Design a protein around this ligand. Structure first.
Ligand SMILES: [Mg+2]
Ligand SMILES: [Mg+2]
Ligand SMILES: [Mg+2]
Ligand SMILES: [Mg+2]
Ligand SMILES: [Mg+2]
Lengths: 171, 191, 234, 137, 197, 72
RNA sequence: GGCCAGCAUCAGUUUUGGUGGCAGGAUAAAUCCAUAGGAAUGUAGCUUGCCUCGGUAAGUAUUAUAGCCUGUG
RNA sequence: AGAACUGGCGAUGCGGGAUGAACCGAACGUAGAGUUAAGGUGCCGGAAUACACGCUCAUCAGACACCACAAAAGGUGUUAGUUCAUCUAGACAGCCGGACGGUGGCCAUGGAAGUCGGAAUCCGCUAAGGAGUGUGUAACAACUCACCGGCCGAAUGAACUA
RNA sequence: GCAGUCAAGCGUUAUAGCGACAUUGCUUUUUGAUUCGAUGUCGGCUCUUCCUAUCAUACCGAAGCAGAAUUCGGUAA
RNA sequence: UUUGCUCCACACAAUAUAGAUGGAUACGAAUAAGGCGUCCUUGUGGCGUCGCUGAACCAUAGCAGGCUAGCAACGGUGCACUUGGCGGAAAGGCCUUGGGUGCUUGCUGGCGAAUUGCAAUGUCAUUUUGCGUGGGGAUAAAUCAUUUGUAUACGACUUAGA
């Protein structure tokens, strides 16, 4: 869906002679908290030897974009599954929010790499502070000073079946 | 990748005027006028000054920008044609049967007539395309000269003349007769 | 897809890297310490036997060639980057194919040698024609009339496509011999030559031009000054 | 008359300071200004005078106008409001036939039955005068 | 909104125009399609010619006069596309089909009637620029239609007459607008502008 | 211009059911061979990621800290 | 009073709108305001080269005759 | 192919998969109203020629079963990635110039000079230059390219993955 | 076909195991010398049409293709 | 075949069924371009303006639209004649001249409307192979039977006969 970002902090259940276990935090992109908790337990089992029956969710909190109306360039480092192994990928996405960039990335993976949400792992989403560190041409072409471009061949939607004039594509 | 904008530049010399409206290019120079229809390609022409004309493609792909470079080359060829002209020199050689090349008028249509090619009784007729002139060279043996402002017309007429004398059912390592383009250049030879 | 495919060769000599440039750099900087006068020489279109004869004549000195940017970096490009004082002027005086002559010989001896040294050279393109050349009518020979045809050898038939296409000389093959129906003018005296005319002169082997080693300036270690010499710089 | 002529084909340009009219959504029919370009299909727009929130929008949800005013790239809402006020975008928009056509359409939609009757009466009077002036010459 | 709708088929895509026309006929609208030779099919001419030749391959083996009938005219190509989208073997489908007429060119009385277009079927509004398309007159001539030149000559004569009519109409429109502009400063005009007219 | 016969793309019920049975048999055989056969069984930081130096410094610092944290 | 209807007030089931009061979260994040730093896709100014009467290319110059980013409040 | 368990079907209609023994949904009194499942919403045909981000152009694309054809093969189609390298002491293309000396290295041959062959394949001078990458000669010549340099001025090349 | 050899890959940190393209041995050895068990369906006549996987006719490409003739191949029913 | 056939005006009588209920309201071409207005040296010309839908335009008030009185203007429109021109793609329509006769809501007045009872399509639009009034116009063929053989199984075909 339209993604949200959460922090999920969990731990192993306290036991006698092992009190106050360590707390582990993840940043999870998910449509809702049920999906976020499921993804947290998946990643926690994949990294540590912690199971859902053996642990508990201490906290889950939605993280909002700090400046949602500022245009940003994001470098997205992702890892996807293959039969030979796990392969890295680095994409650059220009958008105004981390969740918007992540949704764009998931749509691009579904279009191009034929990939799915369960197979795609988001390793890092990092804002590029200086434009000199941007190294994808499809992002760099929009960083030009005094950027102007037209929109030729405008197609106007019609509300009626028949039109009494020949249409124009001027803009 | 969808490049935002891709452009090429076209340089116009002093005596050449260019008029472009809805991708119909007219180029007028000292040697005459040429006209080209480019409505099969979606490009935009802009005039910067009397010496520079830009042609651009917006939000285009690889095939579109290849077409852009092709368009620039075509307009450059038209300019070169109206300012210098094109001149293709062909030579015709034979082993035993002298090839006879004449200019005839068939209801005022200017054909090139080729006789005795390898002793054939057939008369080969190549029409002269409009805008090109055919001259038989002075003090050069068996040389034809095709001149015109249209390199396309001149080169196609030369190719038709070369192909009308194909050697059939003979070893071409041995039978060397034919009409061959010997030189390509410009009509102007001032320097 | 749809890209040009690189042609593949199987030869012995491989490309040189940055290590060769570093070696040349270090050699130039060490010769700067070792020798007294550094002379900048213009040696464009020099033939290797001529250059090696110059090296043999200058036994005891060091002649170093290489990329001009490498040489200027070794000498120091700017005033804060110069290897020695007042060397940036010598470094910026390097232009074209530049050689460095490190020596301890006399300024008079260097000037006298580079004024009195000259060799016969091919007429390069964009130069002046030293003579008027005309290929005579009939059978074309190897020298093209520069020697009597009774002593000369006929031109090989394999060169006729080159003469007809690349040289644009109207030629025919008759009984395995190259022939021209009319005498052909190749060059006129005191005229600028192009690539085609220079190639025709080289193919016929005519070498009437002169090769002279140009000298731009020199630098002295102890004085730390650069003096323009202007030898063969007309 | 020995100079080249090439047809301009003047397009409206997606650029900072380009004024757009939002044609669908919460802010339908309102003017906004382009503050920053995101990509070929999305821009950042801000409409503080008309009440449009600063938002990222697809270029297919807006229509470009021939209006443009000088604006720094990435300008915040206060700067956009100040530059919009200084350039007087609203008056120049309202003076155009596009906005007049929109206003006429809204007025005709707002007319009552009695006002439609009055429109018919006035149209017949104007028709009488216009036909009389047309026949005399 | 009109008893008969006349559609200028020039520059329309055959499948989408056929779909909209079939739905209109089944809903009960009377439709006349003119200039069927100027219709468009997406895809290159050799592709569409190959498709028509496969259709030409289709025929009943033991008697060719019983088989599928291959009509070469552009209006009949469009009619085949329409009949494929109408359930033509039922009485309702036959009645819908009889609310339609298709013509090459514009014969009388339609040459003096208003002609409309269908935006969702228009080539310049639907196809991406650079995509190749076929013209129905050329396709029909390649597959055996023999009245391409006659339609062209009659259409040229119609265009001459229509241009003369439009010149007169434009002169009258200019005169009417001139007379209407000098009444725009009166009180009736001000009241009409206040009411939106 | 003689157009040939085009291959039909209408689905055959018998062919589809046979393909289903063939696929199930293939899956069972692949699973059996994977269980039976004998065969011995991290890409790191992408080079285009801009903060490679920062990631490397962080992982080195964490390694050096955990070197003494678990010891004492 | 037999046949077919219309409206009003209700009940049961359901469908489709308008609008009000609350409560949570980083007691939303933002916008906005103030304050302290910073930089370029460098604003004003200054210098130079030489250009259509000052409109450019390259150096400088961190808010000035535009603005932006970050931290805190 | 043989065992063990569990489903479905025969005795069973209904919605969908165009059509159907084993597929998807759902099991059945007679009706009304509402909502849905599976499957769909260009027209046949009830339902958006909806919205959105990408990809693809097929001289019989595809709208499929995910098995086979299938060698994860071929392609100067196109898109996105991964890893290596080269680069303002100048990247890739292009043009021009250099491409040397012992030496026509030894044997062999009527002839064989880097280039019909068999074995050495070294040294010097170099910025670089093979006891030669090919064309060519009866042998030479000549051209080339391996390598180097001048002009040009900013990104490029290779191998893999999807 | 059987038995090997090589290794572009695949696999691995135990230099195991799979493995395309190539390649060897046997069948088959040097002077162009000198019929062996179809256990159950087959041929004709007349006459039509289809496929192309083309023998001829058409047009092409290559080849020590001089000419003549022929070989290999392309489009083509 | 007890005056058959056929067009023009006038009264009656019925009649309008894939679905009337203000009007199908006429440039062509392009769309990486056009429309309109205007000026000039008339063009691939300069300048201005338009689009972002027909949400338009034209029509549209009056017992389903009655009966009358005036003001202004010489316009608008219906009907029947009539002058001239154009249209052959299936023209069957388009434009126009003049007189006549109506209406005019462009503006201001005077009367009428009811009871269809609180809705019920509440009936309103061209063509009339039917009748009765009337003025002019024109008075045929085909088939069977007979016959030919350029034809033929039979039909059919092809000939001839007041
Ligand atoms: Mg109720
Ligand atoms: Mg429907
Ligand atoms: Mg097969
Ligand atoms: Mg074949
Ligand atoms: Mg009244």
């Amino acid at each position: 869906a339209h993604f949200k970002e959460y922090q999920v902090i969990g731990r192993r259940l306290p036991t006698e002679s092992v009190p106050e276990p360590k707390l582990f935090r993840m940043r999870i992109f998910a449509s809702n908290e049920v999906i976020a908790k499921s993804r947290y337990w998946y990643f926690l089992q994949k990294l540590h030897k912690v199971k859902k029956a053996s642990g508990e969710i201490v906290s889950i909190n939605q993280i909002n974009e700090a400046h949602p109306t500022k245009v940003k360039n994001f470098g997205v480092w992702v890892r996807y599954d293959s039969r030979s192994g796990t392969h890295n990928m680095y994409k650059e996405i220009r958008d105004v929010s981390r969740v918007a960039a992540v949704e764009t990335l998931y749509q691009d993976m579904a279009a191009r790499h034929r990939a799915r949400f369960r197979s795609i792992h988001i390793l890092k989403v990092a804002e590029i502070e200086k434009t000199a560190d941007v190294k994808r041409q499809y992002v760099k072409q929009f960083l030009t000073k005094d950027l102007k471009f037209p929109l030729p061949h405008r197609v106007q939607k019609s509300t009626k079946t028949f039109s009494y004039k020949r249409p124009s594509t001027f803009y | 990748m969808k490049y935002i904008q891709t452009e090429q530049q076209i340089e116009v010399p002093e005596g050449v005027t260019v008029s472009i409206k809805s991708r119909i290019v007219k180029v007028v120079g000292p040697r005459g006028t040429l006209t080209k229809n480019l409505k099969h390609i979606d490009v935009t022409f802009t005039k910067v000054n009397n010496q520079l004309i830009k042609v651009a493609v917006h939000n285009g792909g690889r095939k579109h920008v290849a077409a852009l470079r092709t368009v620039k080359s075509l307009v450059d060829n038209m300019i070169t044609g109206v300012t210098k002209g094109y001149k293709y020199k062909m030579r015709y050689v034979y082993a035993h049967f002298p090839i006879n090349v004449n200019i005839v008028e068939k209801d005022g249509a200017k054909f090139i007539e080729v006789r005795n090619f390898l002793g054939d009784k057939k008369i080969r007729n190549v029409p002269v395309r409009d805008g090109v002139t055919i001259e038989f060279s002075t003090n050069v043996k068996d040389e034809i000269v095709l001149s015109g402002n249209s390199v396309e017309d001149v080169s196609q007429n030369a190719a038709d003349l070369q192909q009308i004398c194909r050697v059939r059912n003979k070893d071409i390592r041995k039978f060397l007769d034919g009409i061959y383009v010997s030189h390509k250049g410009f009509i102007t030879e001032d320097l | 897809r749809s890209k040009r495919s690189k042609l593949v060769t199987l030869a012995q000599t491989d490309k040189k890297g940055r290590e060769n440039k570093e070696r040349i750099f270090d050699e130039v900087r060490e010769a700067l310490d070792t020798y007294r006068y550094v002379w900048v020489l213009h040696l464009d279109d020099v033939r290797t036997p001529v250059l090696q004869e110059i090296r043999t004549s200058w036994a005891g000195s060091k002649l170093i060639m290489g990329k001009r940017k490498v040489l200027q970096k070794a000498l120091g490009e700017k005033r804060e980057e110069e290897y020695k004082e007042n060397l940036y002027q010598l470094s910026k005086l390097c232009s074209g194919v530049t050689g460095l002559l490190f020596t301890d010989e006399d300024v008079n001896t260097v000037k006298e040698y580079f004024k009195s040294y000259v060799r016969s050279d091919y007429s390069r393109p964009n130069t002046k024609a030293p003579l008027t050349f005309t290929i005579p009518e009939g059978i074309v020979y190897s020298r093209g009339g520069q020697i009597p045809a009774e002593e000369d050898v006929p031109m090989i038939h394999s060169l006729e496509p080159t003469m007809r296409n690349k040289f644009e000389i109207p030629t025919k093959i008759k009984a395995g011999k190259i022939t021209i129906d009319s005498p052909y003018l190749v060059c006129t005296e005191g005229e600028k030559l192009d690539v085609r005319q220079a190639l025709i002169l080289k193919q016929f082997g005519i070498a009437a031009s002169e090769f002279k080693v140009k000298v731009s300036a020199y630098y002295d270690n102890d004085s730390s000054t650069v003096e323009s010499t202007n030898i063969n710089m007309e | 008359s020995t100079d080249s002529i090439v047809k301009a084909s003047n397009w409206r340009l997606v650029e900072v300071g380009r004024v757009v009219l939002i044609k669908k959504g919460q802010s339908a029919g309102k003017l906004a200004a382009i503050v920053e370009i995101i990509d070929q299909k999305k821009v950042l727009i801000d409409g503080p005078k008309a009440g449009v929130p600063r938002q990222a929008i697809n270029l297919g949800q807006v229509v470009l106008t021939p209006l443009t005013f000088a604006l720094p790239r990435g300008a915040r809402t206060a700067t956009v409001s100040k530059k919009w006020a200084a350039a007087a975008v609203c008056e120049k928009w309202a003076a155009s036939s596009w906005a007049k056509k929109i206003a006429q359409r809204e007025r005709r939609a707002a007319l009552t039955d009695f006002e439609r009757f009055q429109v018919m009466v006035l149209r017949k009077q104007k028709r009488y005068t216009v036909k009389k002036a047309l026949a005399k010459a | 909104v009109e008893p008969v709708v006349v559609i200028d088929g020039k520059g329309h895509l055959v499948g989408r125009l056929a779909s909209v026309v079939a739905k209109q006929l089944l809903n009960g609208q009377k439709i006349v399609v003119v200039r069927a030779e100027e219709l468009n099919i997406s895809g290159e001419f050799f592709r569409n010619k190959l498709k028509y030749h496969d259709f030409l391959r289709k025929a009943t083996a033991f008697n060719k006069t019983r088989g599928p009938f291959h009509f070469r005219a552009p209006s009949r190509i469009f009619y085949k596309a329409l009949r494929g989208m109408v359930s033509h073997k039922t009485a309702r489908g036959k009645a819908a089909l009889e609310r339609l007429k298709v013509f090459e060119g514009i014969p009388p009385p339609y040459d003096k009637k208003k002609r409309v277009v269908v935006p969702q079927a228009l080539r310049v509004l639907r196809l991406k620029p650079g995509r190749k398309y076929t013209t129905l007159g050329k396709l029909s001539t390649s597959v055996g239609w023999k009245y391409e030149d006659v339609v062209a000559k009659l259409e040229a004569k119609r265009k001459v007459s229509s241009a003369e009519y439009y010149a007169k109409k434009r002169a009258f429109t200019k005169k009417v607008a001139s007379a209407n502009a000098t009444a725009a400063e009166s009180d009736v005009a001000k009241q009409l502008a206040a009411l939106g007219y | 211009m003689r157009v040939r016969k085009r291959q039909s793309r209408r689905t055959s019920t018998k062919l589809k059911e046979g393909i289903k049975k063939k696929a199930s048999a293939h899956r069972k055989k692949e699973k059996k061979m994977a269980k039976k056969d004998v065969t011995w069984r991290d890409p790191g930081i992408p080079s285009n990621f801009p903060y490679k130096a920062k990631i490397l410094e962080e992982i080195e610092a964490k390694k050096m800290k955990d070197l003494e944290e678990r010891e004492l």
